[PDB]
Amino acid sequence: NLWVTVYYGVPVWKDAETTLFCASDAVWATHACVPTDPNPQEIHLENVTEEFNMWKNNMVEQMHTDIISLWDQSLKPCVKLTPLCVTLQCTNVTNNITDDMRGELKNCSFNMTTELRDKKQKVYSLFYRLDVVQINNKEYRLINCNTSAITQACPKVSFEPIPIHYCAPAGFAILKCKDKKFNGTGPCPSVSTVQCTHGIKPVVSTQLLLNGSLAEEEVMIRSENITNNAKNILVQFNTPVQINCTRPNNNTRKSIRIGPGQAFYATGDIIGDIRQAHCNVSKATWNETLGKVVKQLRKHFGNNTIIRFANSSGGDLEVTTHSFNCGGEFFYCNTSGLFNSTWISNNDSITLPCRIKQIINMWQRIGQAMYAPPIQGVIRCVSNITGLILTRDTNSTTETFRPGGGDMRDNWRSELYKYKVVKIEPLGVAPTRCKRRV
Amino acid sequence: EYRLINCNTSAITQACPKVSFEPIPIHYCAPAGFAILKCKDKKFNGTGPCPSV
Amino acid sequence: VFLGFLGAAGSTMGAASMTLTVQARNLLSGIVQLKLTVWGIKQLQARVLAVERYLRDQQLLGIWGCSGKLICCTNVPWNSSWSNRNLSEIWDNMTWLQWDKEISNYTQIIYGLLEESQNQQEKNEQDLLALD
Amino acid sequence: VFLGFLGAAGSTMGAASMTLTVQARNLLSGIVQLKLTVWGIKQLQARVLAVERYLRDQQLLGIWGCSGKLICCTNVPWNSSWSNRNLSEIWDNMTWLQWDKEISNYTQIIYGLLEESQNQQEKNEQDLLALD
Amino acid sequence: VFLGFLGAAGSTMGAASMTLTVQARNLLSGIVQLKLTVWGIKQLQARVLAVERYLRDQQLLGIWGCSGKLICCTNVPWNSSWSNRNLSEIWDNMTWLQWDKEISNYTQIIYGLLEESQNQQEKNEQDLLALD
Ligand SMILES: *[C@@H]1O[C@H](CO)[C@@H](O[C@@H]2O[C@H](CO)[C@@H](O[C@@H]3O[C@H](CO[C@H]4O[C@H](CO)[C@@H](O)[C@H](O[C@H]5O[C@H](CO)[C@@H](O)[C@H](O)[C@@H]5O)[C@@H]4O)[C@@H](O)[C@H](O[C@H]4O[C@H](CO)[C@@H](O)[C@H](O)[C@@H]4O[C@H]4O[C@H](CO)[C@@H](O)[C@H](O)[C@@H]4O)[C@@H]3O)[C@H](O)[C@H]2NC(C)=O)[C@H](O)[C@H]1NC(C)=O
Numbered sequence: 001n002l003w004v005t006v007y008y009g010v011p012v013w014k015d016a017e018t019t020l021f022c023a024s025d026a027v028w029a030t031h032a033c034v035p036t037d038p039n040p041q042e043i044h045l046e047n048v049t050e051e052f053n054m055w056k057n058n059m060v061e062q063m064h065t066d067i068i069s070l071w072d073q074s075l076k077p078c079v080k081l082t083p084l085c086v087t088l089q090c091t092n093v094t095n096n097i098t099d100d101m102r103g104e105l106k107n108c109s110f111n112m113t114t115e116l117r118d119k120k121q122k123v124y125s126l127f128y129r130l131d132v133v134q135i136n137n138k139e140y141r142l143i144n145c146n147t148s149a150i151t152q153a154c155p156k157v158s159f160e161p162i163p164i165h166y167c168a169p170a171g172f173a174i175l176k177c178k179d180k181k182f183n184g185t186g187p188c189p190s191v192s193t194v195q196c197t198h199g200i201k202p203v204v205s206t207q208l209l210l211n212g213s214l215a216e217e218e219v220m221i222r223s224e225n226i227t228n229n230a231k232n233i234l235v236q237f238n239t240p241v242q243i244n245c246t247r248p249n250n251n252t253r254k255s256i257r258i259g260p261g262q263a264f265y266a267t268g269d270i271i272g273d274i275r276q277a278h279c280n281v282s283k284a285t286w287n288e289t290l291g292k293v294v295k296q297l298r299k300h301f302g303n304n305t306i307i308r309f310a311n312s313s314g315g316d317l318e319v320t321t322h323s324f325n326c327g328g329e330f331f332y333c334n335t336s337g338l339f340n341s342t343w344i345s346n347n348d349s350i351t352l353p354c355r356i357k358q359i360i361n362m363w364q365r366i367g368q369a370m371y372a373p374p375i376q377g378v379i380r381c382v383s384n385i386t387g388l389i390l391t392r393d394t395n396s397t398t399e400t401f402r403p404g405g406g407d408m409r410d411n412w413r414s415e416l417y418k419y420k421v422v423k424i425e426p427l428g429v430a431p432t433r434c435k436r437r438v
Numbered sequence: 439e440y441r442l443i444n445c446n447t448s449a450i451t452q453a454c455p456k457v458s459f460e461p462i463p464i465h466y467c468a469p470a471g472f473a474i475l476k477c478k479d480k481k482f483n484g485t486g487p488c489p490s491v
Numbered sequence: 492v493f494l495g496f497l498g499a500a501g502s503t504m505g506a507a508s509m510t511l512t513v514q515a516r517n518l519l520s521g522i523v524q525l526k527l528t529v530w531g532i533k534q535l536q537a538r539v540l541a542v543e544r545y546l547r548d549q550q551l552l553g554i555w556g557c558s559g560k561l562i563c564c565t566n567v568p569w570n571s572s573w574s575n576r577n578l579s580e581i582w583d584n585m586t587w588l589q590w591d592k593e594i595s596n597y598t599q600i601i602y603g604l605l606e607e608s609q610n611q612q613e614k615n616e617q618d619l620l621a622l623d
Numbered sequence: 624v625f626l627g628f629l630g631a632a633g634s635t636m637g638a639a640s641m642t643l644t645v646q647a648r649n650l651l652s653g654i655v656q657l658k659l660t661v662w663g664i665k666q667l668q669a670r671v672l673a674v675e676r677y678l679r680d681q682q683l684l685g686i687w688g689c690s691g692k693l694i695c696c697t698n699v700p701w702n703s704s705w706s707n708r709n710l711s712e713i714w715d716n717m718t719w720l721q722w723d724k725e726i727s728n729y730t731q732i733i734y735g736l737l738e739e740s741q742n743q744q745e746k747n748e749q750d751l752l753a754l755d
Numbered sequence: 756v757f758l759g760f761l762g763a764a765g766s767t768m769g770a771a772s773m774t775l776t777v778q779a780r781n782l783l784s785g786i787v788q789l790k791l792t793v794w795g796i797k798q799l800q801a802r803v804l805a806v807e808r809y810l811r812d813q814q815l816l817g818i819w820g821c822s823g824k825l826i827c828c829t830n831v832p833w834n835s836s837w838s839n840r841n842l843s844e845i846w847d848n849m850t851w852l853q854w855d856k857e858i859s860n861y862t863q864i865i866y867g868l869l870e871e872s873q874n875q876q877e878k879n880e881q882d883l884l885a886l887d
Pocket residue numbers: 160161210211324325326327376377381382383384
């Protein structure tokens with residue numbers, strides 16, 4: 001007869017959420033974080049299979065709110081720009097006649113309170129017409145002042161995305177499938193496990209995904225519900241698509257001592273190649289990759305349907321255009337130049353017009369706003385487009401797709417789908433032929 | 439015309455009239471597993487072996 | 492042969508029992524190594540939860556007179572209603588995950604007798620053997 | 624019969640010993656399950672103090688060679704000065720609370736020999752039995 | 756004779772072994788007893804680190820089938836390459852600090868066999884003695 005035998009160290013686990021913590025090397029917000037191991041360990045697990053589900057992966061939720069928390073903490077100790085909310089006296093800026101630049105900035109002046117709380121000083125600064133609005137030269141207002149206060153980001157702190165690793169506490173395991181195929185959820189024939197995750201950069205962007213990871217095999221299409229056009233579609237590329245964006249303005253920073261003590265960085269003068277900031281895209285590369293994407297689409301909609309690509313529905317600029325950070329500066333680009341195509345039934349280069357804003361609102365959050373300091377000198381950078389955030393638009397053939405975003409949990413999820421966290425249960429029992437003596 | 443010297447560098451805060459600045463003897467302790475070692479050697483160069491620990 | 496953490500997870504319960512310690516070590520792990528700040532109380536909380544997580548079950552093994560754990564026998568007989576399979580149908584043809592899939596239904600029920608029967612009776616008895 | 628947490632508190636020490644485990648479990652309990660905030664570091668502090676509170680005495684039982692606790696014997700004889708009563712006057716006619724009322728006077732004194740005597744001598748001895 | 760915490764630190768390893776418990780007690784110590792504030796999370800952190808510091812190694816002694824610690828034997832033979840000295844050259848003529856000075860070189864190496872060999876083999880074996 002068999003008896004109850006007690007076992008400990010049993011290799012079993014249940015899907016469970018706990019509090020994850022970071023790790024990264026030894027700028028943005030990361031210093032108070034445990035350095036990574038010089039030899040991150042892993043182990044493929046043979047005969048071990050189980051389901052993943054990226055759409056209920058609470059790792060995303062934590063990461064999201066943690067990044068937000070970091071953001072706020074990095075701003076509290078910086079200078080508040082409360083006394084900037086004043087009536088502005090502004091005029092057009094006579095760019096090289098006649099007018100290709102459309103101005104876009106105003107030579108605003110105003111009676112400003114200085115360190116000598118008492119006698120004020122008439123000063124001036126160049127502002128983008130996206131930041132200011134006419135009251136009622138003419139009178140203008142900082143747009144934020146009708147919604148909330150605004151804080152100047154410190155000139156020392158940066159916004160450069162840094163690779164972050166996530167680790168689980170003892171008793172919890174980081175599981176990672178290596179299956180090159182994945183529908184977004186279901187069993188994985190090839191499952192491994194790791195100490196911690198790979199370095200993920202906290203890149204904030206809409207519409208286009210930047211500097212992410214690459215997919216293997218073919219282009220990956222992932223969606224909570226492909227047939228439901230109330231949902232959206234994640235597209236992961238196989239090959240990095242280069243994009244090179246430039247701001248050809250060697251401008252200065254007429255910092256103004258609007259104390260007491262604390263200093264404000266206003267916009268000095270704009271000189272150099274007065275052209276609109278824009279992005280350069282390899283056209284043939286875009287066409288080629290887009291095609292590869294359409295192949296996938298064909299595979300989930302039929303071998304006799306029509307695929308069209310267009311821009312967004314419009315509205316809030318933050319959603320309408322492609323937003324991203326380069327070197328502290330915030331760009332808004334008209335991606336109509338990319339998302340304008342079509343496919344049937346079965347250099348060259350592209351220039352994307354961009355705009356610059358200085359007053360921005362993070363993560364759709366209202367109640368506060370952050371002032372970007374102007375960055376001195378010409379700003380230009382390059383990155384890898386590694387995926388798309390697409391939405392699905394008389395429904396028997398032609399379908400139209402367009403870029404979206406808004407919810408930045410989407411961005412974190414586009415990477416964390418490779419991971420899941422489980423809770424180990426060391427204690428188990430089993431029937432064994434054994435009668436225990438004294 | 440004169441100016442408070444601090445105003446060109448930063449803001450300034452008034453120390454509370456109740457709080458004092460009198461130095462008070464503080465003792466330091468280590469958590470369990472750690473030991474506080476103390477040489478009693480009247481001689482010491484600033485570093486090196488102590489015959490009497 | 493050293494396999495690695497959970498290296499035997501994809502094997503039969505008999506096979507897996509070979510290397511329970513390789514797992515045991517990292518069940519508590521250890522090491523790891525402007526105030527507050529994000530992570531400031533998260534590494535705190537997590538590292539705490541690890542300790543609790545561990546001891547909560549370790550104490551049960553303390554109560555279930557074994558202590559010298561990973562494996563130990565009892566004097567509680569196995570009730571046939573708790574998944575009636577043969578040893579070769581169990582130990583030589585089933586993983587631990589597959590095992591739990593079934594037996595998990597009677598977890599607290601089995602714990603009842605483990606928490607008690609023997610622990611109660613093994614003692615008293617001894618106290619009586621100490622009479623002389 | 625399951626009585627409940629401290630269910631035997633109002634009985635003789637002999638009777639109470641029947642169900643020490645029912646209490647033992649909840650001596651550490653476990654489970655439980657804008658930053659800071661009131662309670663934010665209080666649940667923290669309390670849950671910590673529980674762990675320390677437990678182990679501080681558990682280690683003593685570790686030192687006092689038993690480990691398999693709730694009950695164990697020693698090789699230290701009882702000094703008659705420590706409340707000279709008969710077994711029936713003690714075990715069959717006194718609660719644990721009433722017991723402490725008296726014996727608490729010699730707590731550290733008794734701990735001295737428990738902390739030592741046997742722990743010292745049981746060993747060495749064994750080391751010597753291992754000679755052959 | 757009570758010496759005090761680390762009172763035998765300046766003696767031979769043989770002599771020092773007499774009073775290991777006097778040290779053992781304070782390895783975890785216990786007791787100790789506007790928000791945040793300096794010290795507010797430092798006493799916190801420190802007291803935590805003490806608990807972890809302790810258990811991290813205590814678990815190893817749990818794995819190394821002894822538990823009844825301070826001293827216990829194994830079934831692992833000593834490799835002569837690990838500082839080849841005689842017992843009188845070691846135990847009767849060397850402090851623990853001096854000992855570590857040398858043997859520390861093979862710490863993890865020795866731990867390998869302690870973590871395993873016996874722990875693996877002592878068991879199975881027993882399981883087989885339980886056949887009848
Ligand atoms: C997708 O990923 C890619 C790949 O990671 C990203 O591409 C990177 O983008 C970052 C910006 O986000 C670029 O960083 C820049 O690097 C510049 C080059 O510096 C190197 O060359 C210089 C010139 O000789 C050397 O002196 C440097 O050496 C030193 O620094 C390193 C690192 O600290 C040390 O390890 C060395 O020991 C040296 O000390 C480098 O080798 C760099 O100049 C530039 O820094 C300026 O600009 C930043 C703000 O961006 C200022 O904070 C900083 O003060 C610098 O400004 C000074 O210099 C400029 C020069 O003109 C002056 O104009 C200023 O007045 C001031 O004096 C910055 O760090 C990086 O080049 C780039 N990498 C690649 C692969 O191209 C993409 O960003 C990413 N995409 C997205 C969407 O983010």
